[PDB]
Amino acid sequence: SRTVDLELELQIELLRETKRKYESVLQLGRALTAHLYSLLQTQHALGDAFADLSQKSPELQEEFGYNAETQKLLCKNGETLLGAVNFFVSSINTLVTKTMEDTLMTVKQYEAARLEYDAYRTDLEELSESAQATFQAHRDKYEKLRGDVAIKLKFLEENKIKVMHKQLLLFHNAVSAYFAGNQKQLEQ
């Protein structure tokens, strides 16, 4: 036995998975950040290195400077990308750590309430003035949070889209542009 709200329960476990997956995109995102950092430095270094050998290697001066610059350039455009990914990682983290978390809070309570209700109810059953009353209390708290959950769940699926949609657009734009300005210059 149990007080099943099937429709809402599904929406709940669904939010729970969307949550996990997002926290995974969230990993990769952060990690991506770490690698961009690593490249930038390596490229910055390799830039100064190639530059130096060019300055002190006549026979290969053209080939070294050649590489020095592209590396010096890939370093800058690399910063831009790093910035944008950080903005991506950051904005979704809110959506997941604040907004989404918030709702999950009331989803907790509703489940607690939904449980103490089924709970008390079962005692009366196994046992069989205020008894009806307190039985009413439990029910009203459950039905109350039940409503809250249904409201918050829709305002979330609501913001989830407006955020992700904007965030994914920017991100793609950023990784893309991280090629428009690198080709138009590394091949210029």
Binding site: R30, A34, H44, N86
Partner: protein
């Protein structure tokens, strides 16, 4: 929980070995690792799962422009100095603290004295003596920790892993609170 901790400070203080020693559990002795490589670790601090991301940095001046590019979104910093190197110690208030503050005012800072195993080393005390220099004392480290308003002051050795683990449990606690 995700926690980003970045380690700053002079080159040759021990930053790289610190991270490697802590994540692997093996002093990166005999091979010295990949250059601008970062690290990560899965730990349990007081019964909570944490994905600790460890960012290494370039101490050198040449990186003054790009080292900070790692600061955004950081949860806690590790400003490091070598206990047997007064030079790095002075640089704490001199360079690192102001930099980390310029960029991140309000972020948990934790001061770390590294190479602890050396502060009480015979030849190290002597070699240092030749240069009329002497190791940094716990009180000195403690005073510094206060001067820069650091939530904690820890000392450790990436070699004997003495104090090591603690540096990170406390780091996480400064974020979790």
């Amino acid at each position: 929980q995700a926690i980003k901790c970045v380690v700053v400070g002079d080159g040759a203080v021990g930053k790289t070995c610190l991270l490697i020693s802590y994540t692997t559990n093996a002093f990166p002795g005999e091979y010295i690792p990949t250059v601008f490589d970062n690290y990560s670790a899965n730990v349990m601090v007081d019964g909570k799962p944490v994905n600790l991301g460890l960012w290494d940095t370039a101490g050198q001046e040449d990186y003054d422009r790009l080292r900070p590019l790692s600061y955004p979104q950081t949860d806690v910093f590790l400003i490091c100095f070598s206990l047997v190197s007064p030079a790095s110690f002075e640089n704490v208030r001199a360079k690192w603290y102001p930099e980390v503050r310029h960029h991140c005012p309000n972020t948990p800072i934790i001061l770390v004295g590294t190479k602890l195993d050396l502060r009480d080393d015979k030849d190290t005390i002597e070699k240092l003596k030749e240069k009329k220099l002497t190791p940094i004392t716990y009180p000195q480290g403690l005073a510094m920790a206060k001067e820069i308003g650091a939530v904690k002051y820890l000392e450790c050795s990436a070699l004997t892993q003495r104090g090591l683990k603690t540096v990170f449990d406390e780091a996480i606690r400064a974020v979790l609170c």
